[PDB]
Structure 1
Amino acid sequence: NQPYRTGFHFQPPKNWMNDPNGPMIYKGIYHLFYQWNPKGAVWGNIVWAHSTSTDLINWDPHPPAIFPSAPFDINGCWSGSATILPNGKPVILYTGIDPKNQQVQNIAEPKNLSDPYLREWKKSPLNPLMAPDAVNGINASSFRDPTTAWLGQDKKWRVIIGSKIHRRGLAITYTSKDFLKWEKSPEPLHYDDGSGMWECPDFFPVTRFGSNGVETSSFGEPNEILKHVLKISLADTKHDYYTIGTYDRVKDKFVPDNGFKMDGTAPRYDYGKYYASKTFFDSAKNRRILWGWTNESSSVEDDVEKGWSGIQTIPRKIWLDRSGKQLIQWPVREVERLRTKQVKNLRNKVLKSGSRLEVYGVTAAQADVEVLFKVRDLEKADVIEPSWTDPQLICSKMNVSVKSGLGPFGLMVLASKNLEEYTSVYFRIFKARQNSNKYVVLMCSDQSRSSLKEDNDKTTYGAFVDINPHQPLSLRALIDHSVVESFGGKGRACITSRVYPKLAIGKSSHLFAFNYGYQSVDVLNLNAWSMNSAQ
């Protein structure tokens, strides 16, 4: 019996899953590889597992693609990325562990380029293409995760590798004119002092105005103003951060926009349980897709007990916000195909102070729900306390029991009949400590009351949303048994959490809208779809 296995998120039939690997589209087929343990529910014996799709939702298995079978990767096949060469040919750059336990960079390419599912991959010699040594002095124990490579205006390829030198994180950048002979640049594309190791780095352009994706090597088209994103997975904090800036192709550096620092004080893709993010360019739809690894919030005991660990968020479409300050994400449209044609709809319903509204007629552990909340009188929101800068510390300081002028209001997902178990995703609104009348919208994902099992990770997640509370506040949540993916302000803030209820399972879960704030807020619209299982 498996109450926590997802009905429609990507996870292997069994065992431990980890980083998403070399995602790509080839011959109109979507590919996903991933770090897999073929014989355990913990990390180990790590190989590139492999599934394919035509819609990014239903995945067909294939035997592992990249596994230890040569000096350059004999002690493991760590993370990496697929580049698609200008002639449509796809290649994987991945980190392998050698006889000396050194992290080195290997190329792998398909052996049958006419196989539409690219089942078997051949590797060099002359692998490794990139390795630490005495001359470059790269930390052999911290040199992993090559990105998708991009082609410069000087016919030379660039690729970065996450690394660190003495508690300074950097994107070690290599150049190559043939994709076979790679040479280290004197200086990295970017670095941050005091940040740890830089894992799973990503580097890609975005249009300044538009929802569409940009091919990874593009400079034009003239005219069209581009912006560049550098994303890192910060090993110490265990979060993925990105910064928006410009790519000086002359110096071959990355320059973060004024109002950013790549270490710590940066925006996250996701303010909950989300790690080792990776994007690819979906040439089929001209969109950039972001893959993300949500690991397990239960005990390791539980993981080995259920015999699997780790899921993948449903893929996000990602693009720049109009104001240029952050990225927007939104679950790929395809996932909406999983919705039943029946749809529970509630409109213009008032939530008085301290109220809640059950929403029936849905499979409440496997569902998609979208709400529009309208605030009646913004002059009623409490002025935000002076030293409240961390949105995670606000949500954890004040639970749904503590009441604000406006908020807490939102959804209670994965909830038991009598509410002993519930996961609350919600908003609070404040007036800011500014001379201009600006409001601060808080999004929380509180899971302290989430499950009766006590040794689950009940960490509460939190985020600010850049939306105007004059217009109605939008909240979506994908609910899938042991995962909720909350989206605030139409993708302006995303929180993934992991939840393991003992009561709120299958038949026995709701599903509430609620409001415990001082002022009564209006539910403008509520759509709830039951969700069919994938694959």
Structure 2
Amino acid sequence: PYPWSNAQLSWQRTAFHFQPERSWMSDPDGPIFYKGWYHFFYQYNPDNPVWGNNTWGHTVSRDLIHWLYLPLALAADQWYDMQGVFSGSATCLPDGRIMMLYTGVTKEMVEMLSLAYPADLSDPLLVEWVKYPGNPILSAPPGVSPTEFRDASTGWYVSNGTWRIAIGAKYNTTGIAMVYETKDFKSFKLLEELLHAVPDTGLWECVDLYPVSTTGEKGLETSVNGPKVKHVLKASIDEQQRDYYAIGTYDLGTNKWTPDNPEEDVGIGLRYDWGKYYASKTFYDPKKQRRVVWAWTKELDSEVADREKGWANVQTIPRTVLLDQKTGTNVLLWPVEEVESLRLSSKEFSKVKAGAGSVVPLDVGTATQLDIIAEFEIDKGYNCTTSGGAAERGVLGPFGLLVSATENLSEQTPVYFYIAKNFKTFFCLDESRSSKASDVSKQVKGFTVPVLDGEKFTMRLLVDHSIVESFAQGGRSCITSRVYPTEAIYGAAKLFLFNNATGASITASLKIWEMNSAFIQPFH
């Protein structure tokens, strides 16, 4: 347990990530774009920087970056949600109505579906929210435990006025997605056919079903279906606390979602992000025609420090989701382009050489609010999770960057590539020496990333105080983590290009932008 100082703790607050004024924040709730505003809701504890007393916080922005706080949307003030207003999604009907479905928890820990809607649809800020007088609207079916009945998805249209929603759950150890039909969002009929099921995964929370285009570069409206359309099915795997997705096809007539590759099904395949990244939710953005993904990153320090600093957890910069057309077997996640409006000034590092076992300093000034874009070239079984990080030297790795580093390398956070034997390219983030404090996470995170002939090894890094977001090969693989250094803070945080390979030297070109505050404050 580290004697954290006020100066060390205040430094952890983010400059441009969404974060409430104080206290605990969790799952993204009912993201929508309505009347010129991006709407974001989130699990929020009014009382303490720990999970509990769940309410829905509410915030708005013109651009998905410059957020403005609004009053609480939903409180724990009805018998059916007295134990908490858990997560939920929004469906926007063609008549202009917004239906917000959420799970409310009773004093007996019973989870039941409820309906909320705006008190005034003419208000673009959607400040006030009303709970349907006839709540609660749906309780667990005979095969599902009433204490584990959660997370209604955004609905998709069938025909004749009927919509479909997904509620994840489990049969014994099999993860499942149930589908309910409705016409009025007040009565729900359980379909006999499950959306999909995968053995040995466990509880599926926060289930997401959405379509992706195979030809374009735009997101698809949630109800879009066809023979040229593929469907991503995503679930939060409760037992692991990590989000998994799979690429497949969905048939309206059958209601079955079928994976493109059974060996990479939901829960046993790929993730949006290989780091700390949970309860991810997507919404369709009509203005720029994107599908955007929200996900929260938990603190990786001690609860003692969380209580000391008075706040816990952040949301990541929202990302676009698009099908990787060059592989056909993964998605591409990339920060929304509006993050670039935070860029103040740039510095370029052209063709910087880094020999075997070397470390090259990159003078950028302050290295705590950065947007880094780098390309790597190599001049003329492994597993990130069980590797020794940047210390484990190989013939063609590890090489990459050192963020949140100290002058004398006493604290460092490597984000790196590793080429192992055909070639498997690994992308990892190494926490093992991030901080001199022992009451923080020290794991090494990462996975393989596809690298195609003719491509340079590229990485993007978003450095924002206590949170780093990393992107390999244009977003084929992402790693989000938290850092809590004791010395590598304020002016003392440095950036390094590093090569700890033995067999080769690397040549990197970089560009580094300093990043402004998102100026997240209350609404005017």
Q: How high is the TM-score relative to the length of structure 2?
A: 0.94
Corresponding residue to 1:165 among 136, 160, 171 = 171
- Identify the residue that residue 275 of structure 1 maps to in structure 2: 278
Corresponding residue to 2:339 among 317, 335, 338 = 335
Q: Secondary structure at the match of 2:65?
A: coil
Correspondence 1:139-158 to 2 at 5 A: 139-158=145-164
Contact 2:384 2:426 in 1 (8 A): no
Q: Deviation digits for residues 223-273 of structure 1, max 9, x if unmatched?
A: x71100110000111110001111121121111113444353211000001
Give the letter aligned to residue 18 of structure 2.
F
1:293 partnered with 2:296: yes
Corresponding residue to 1:392 among 384, 389, 395 = 384
Q: How high is the TM-score relative to the length of structure 1?
A: 0.93
Corresponding residue to 1:74 among 69, 82, 86 = 82
Instruction: Please state how far the C-alpha of 1:518 moved relative to its aligned partner.
Output: 1.4
Q: Secondary structure at the match of 2:434?
A: coil
Q: Secondary structure at the match of 1:360?
A: coil
- Identify the residue that residue 13 of structure 2 maps to in structure 1: 5
- Identify the residue that residue 313 of structure 2 maps to in structure 1: 310
1:510 partnered with 2:494: yes
CA–CA distance in structure 2, aligned partners of residues 235 and 419 of structure 1: 37
CA–CA distance in structure 2, aligned partners of residues 512 and 524 of structure 1: 12
1:429 partnered with 2:437: no
Instruction: Please state how far the C-alpha of 1:99 moved relative to its aligned partner.
Output: 4.4
Give the letter aligned to residue 204 of structure 1.
Y
CA–CA distance in structure 2, aligned partners of residues 22 and 480 of structure 1: 26
Segments of structure 2 that go 5 or more residues without pairing to the other structure are 1-6, 520-524
Correspondence 1:224-303 to 2 at 5 A: 225-303=228-306
CA–CA distance in structure 2, aligned partners of residues 351 and 477 of structure 1: 19
Instruction: Please state how far the C-alpha of 1:37 moved relative to its aligned partner.
Output: 0.5
CA–CA distance in structure 2, aligned partners of residues 219 and 276 of structure 1: 25
- Identify the residue that residue 414 of structure 1 maps to in structure 2: 404
Correspondence 1:452-491 to 2 at 5 A: 452-468=436-452, 470-491=454-475
Corresponding residue to 2:394 among 366, 388, 404 = 404
Q: Secondary structure at the match of 1:211?
A: coil
- Identify the residue that residue 111 of structure 2 maps to in structure 1: 103
Contact 1:363 1:531 in 2 (8 A): no
- Identify the residue that residue 510 of structure 2 maps to in structure 1: 526
Q: Secondary structure at the match of 1:285?
A: coil
CA–CA distance in structure 2, aligned partners of residues 137 and 470 of structure 1: 52
Contact 1:375 1:472 in 2 (8 A): no
User: Structure 1's 297 and 446: CA in aligned 2 closer, same or farther, altered over 3 A?
Assistant: same
- Identify the residue that residue 14 of structure 1 maps to in structure 2: 22
CA–CA distance in structure 2, aligned partners of residues 153 and 208 of structure 1: 24
CA–CA distance in structure 2, aligned partners of residues 461 and 128 of structure 1: 41
CA–CA distance in structure 2, aligned partners of residues 258 and 232 of structure 1: 16
Give the letter aligned to residue 415 of structure 2.
V
CA–CA distance in structure 2, aligned partners of residues 4 and 503 of structure 1: 12
Q: Number of matched residues?
A: 510
Q: Deviation digits for residues 515-535 of structure 1, max 9, x if unmatched?
A: 011134343420011111112
CA–CA distance in structure 1, aligned partners of residues 419 and 444 of structure 2: 18
- Identify the residue that residue 380 of structure 1 maps to in structure 2: none
Q: Secondary structure at the match of 1:146?
A: coil
Give the letter aligned to residue 113 of structure 1.
L
CA–CA distance in structure 1, aligned partners of residues 285 and 152 of structure 2: 19
CA–CA distance in structure 1, aligned partners of residues 78 and 278 of structure 2: 29
Segments of structure 1 that go 5 or more residues without pairing to the other structure are 378-384, 433-438
Corresponding residue to 2:55 among 47, 62, 77 = 47
Instruction: Please state how far the C-alpha of 1:83 moved relative to its aligned partner.
Output: 1.1
Q: Secondary structure at the match of 1:304?
A: helix
- Identify the residue that residue 325 of structure 1 maps to in structure 2: 329
Q: Deviation digits for residues 85-140 of structure 1, max 9, x if unmatched?
A: 1223222110101244211111111011111100111111322222125xx34210
- Identify the residue that residue 185 of structure 1 maps to in structure 2: 191
CA–CA distance in structure 2, aligned partners of residues 189 and 235 of structure 1: 18
Q: Deviation digits for residues 1-53 of structure 1, max 9, x if unmatched?
A: 40111111111111011111111100121011000000101111110000000
CA–CA distance in structure 1, aligned partners of residues 213 and 159 of structure 2: 19
Q: Secondary structure at the match of 2:495?
A: strand
CA–CA distance in structure 2, aligned partners of residues 296 and 532 of structure 1: 23
- Identify the residue that residue 131 of structure 1 maps to in structure 2: 139
1:495 partnered with 2:479: yes
Q: Secondary structure at the match of 2:151?
A: strand
Q: Deviation digits for residues 439-472 of structure 1, max 9, x if unmatched?
A: 2111110110100011101111011111136531
Contact 2:231 2:249 in 1 (8 A): yes
Runs (4 or more) in structure 1 with deviation over 6 Å come to none
CA–CA distance in structure 2, aligned partners of residues 443 and 490 of structure 1: 13
Q: Secondary structure at the match of 1:428?
A: strand
Correspondence 1:113-128 to 2 at 5 A: 113-128=121-136
Instruction: Please state how far the C-alpha of 1:153 moved relative to its aligned partner.
Output: 3.4
CA–CA distance in structure 2, aligned partners of residues 524 and 498 of structure 1: 25
Instruction: Please state how far the C-alpha of 1:166 moved relative to its aligned partner.
Output: 1.9
Identity %: 44
CA–CA distance in structure 1, aligned partners of residues 216 and 198 of structure 2: 30
